[model samples]
Target: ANVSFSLSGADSKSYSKFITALRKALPSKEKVSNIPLLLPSASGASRYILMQLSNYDAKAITMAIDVTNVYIMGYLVNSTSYFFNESDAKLASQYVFKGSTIVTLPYSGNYERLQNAAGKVREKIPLGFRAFDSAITSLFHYDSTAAAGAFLVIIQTTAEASRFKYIEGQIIKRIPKNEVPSPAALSLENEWSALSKQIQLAQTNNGAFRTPVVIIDNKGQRVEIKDVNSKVVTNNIKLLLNKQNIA
Candidate 1:
């Protein structure tokens, strides 16, 4: 990827001020900071996720997801490009499944309401316009839709950053306190409560609340306690939490 940074009409005071403001406006501590993450999924291929700040307020954070010629159970589900702002992709991302013409979300105007209507939902999504650009990555996962927990990658984020911060950077892990959780999410969290105890058997579990043992409310296959060793199951839980970071 080619990345370059420069400002036009550079002034002594105004230019410096503009740069300073961005520095003060780093996203919330818990919010996901804007960054680009390349992750592998349970399926063979991988999906590339790029989160960007859309406006001066950083109110609107956009997430772009792309999948390329990655093999999954030996299938030819074509690649995809799904981009959006405000609308959370985990709940309402528009994607084209393997070998299917049907596209999700893009065609639904009532998508937000629908996800909320489904039951448990994440907190309020950042506000703003769309500003995401992603390409097919020759990796393993399908799209975010198939694997809701795919967005949790702790790697460094490209996040439209300037080696600094501001209105023009990227948004990450922070979810608004005022925002509500979907029933599905609530249910999933309940299950995690017991699992969290099992995973943090050693430490005081300082930031253990940071991640979850479930992906969605009902679909928590990885952390399920089905005669599985605590090490592997807890490790699986750790992977999801490991990605919700501010490093």
Candidate 2:
């Protein structure tokens, strides 16, 4: 399931080229869920990691965890570690970068890969934003101005993990400093309703995304994807991200 977070700021700059370059470079479905765009500018690099949350519970920790997990995955795939070892990480990239792909079935067996992410994320997760509508991530920083800013969105329940059912885009807009924002009491209900519809549209796709994974295990050959447990998938990826030989 997938949902998109659209942003368009009031600045003189627009990221349409970033989206274009990214779309042209993307493997149609090789490296990104919907679109993980990167931009090149006079300032050097302007990038963003965005997610759309259904059931916006500004009060829930689960939502934050989900966002962090994807962010971790995003960081790893984009990290030098992944690129350093093409053989090992390319397999990993297929999982992280693309919206969809057909993979050989994964054998049923306990894999060290899945365990690492489960433990690391569960134990260390404490993600957040400096202020509503704003965030400062250590993901990447190569800028010409300290005043540079980026927007981020966190998600819950179903997110754009693989195969997008529906999506939206935006660069963000800044309301006048003196202008008042909508009150949560009056606007929160509408926000939730809209997100639910977006998610529902995605679910309507019937999970017809991708299938099959071939995993060689001690027990012999057993190829499958749906059969892959969440835990195993979790650790397998974390190990690769850390460049731990993924053996």
Candidate 3:
């Protein structure tokens, strides 16, 4: 895969510092390389990287980091035949790019437990539907009592192969260790958007915005629920169940 860099001007100091920290955090053998794509900048602005991935069906991957936020995104591409299930997505990620830092830690969340809780107990239920699509696998636990026809359960998934890393004006493949204090979040919002769209599309084929859907996240969908039993999760599900929303 080829990597390219872009930066807002006048912020070379922060850029250099971020790069240094990235190199230090990464394994020593991994070399970071870049083709400069410099453009004028406002001070303290964000920087970005554009990467080419071989297996994502021709989508360019964008990675960005600013003073407080960072993210990676892959544009929409066909995933209808990509993998069989959610587990297959993780396995394919690990198997296809075993050594690249471009492949980061798995997406993290406690959505499965929430799924279990929702299944076992309208509040919660034992029956749900499995919806497959080009993006990711989703489970639908429809709430009959809700005034709305749809309530979404969005959770992060580790199907994305890349972990978070930092690099100076360059992109190299290697996982980074926690040697530096950086921003608390690394987002996959782009991925989450696509996943959300896919779930909505999947639902459209069966029924329009009628089923309560769970959108498994990568860069595509998001809902931060640390524990399924927490009041926050419980209330979130309750709110979703009671609301009148579509996909």
Question: Judged by TM-score, which candidate is best?
Answer: 2
Looking at model 3, residue 57 earns an lDDT score of 27
* Candidates, ranked, lDDT: 1, 3, 2
Q: For candidate 1, which ten residues in a row score worst on lDDT?
A: 67-76
Question: What RMSD does each model have against the real structure?
Answer: 18.7, 17.9, 20.3
**Candidate 3 regions off by >4 Å?**
1-46, 56-68, 73-247
Which of 2 and 3 is ahead in TM-score? 2
lDDT of 3 by residue, 1-247 (tens): 2232222231345334443443232222211111111122212222322232221122222222211111222111232111112332333343333334432222212334333433421122211111111112221111223201111111111111122222121122111211211111123222222222333343335423222324333344554423233222222111111011213
- TM-score for all predictions? 0.20, 0.22, 0.18
Ranking of candidates on TM-score, top first: 2, 1, 3
Model 3, TM vs. native = 0.18
| Tens-place lDDT digits, model 1, residues 1-247 | 0111122232234333533443233222231112212122222212322323222222222233232101011111234433223333332233323333423432222223324433323333221111111111211234444222112110112221122232122222111111222343334333433443333332334323333444332243344343224332432222112122212
The residue-by-residue lDDT of candidate 2 on 77-157, one tens digit each, is: 122211112232233444343443322212111112322322322112222222223322221231112101111222111
Q: Against the unseen true structure, what C-alpha lDDT does each candidate score? A: 0.27, 0.23, 0.24
The lowest-lDDT stretch of 10 consecutive residues in candidate 2 is 238-247
Q: Candidate 1: deviation at residue 143, Å? A: 16
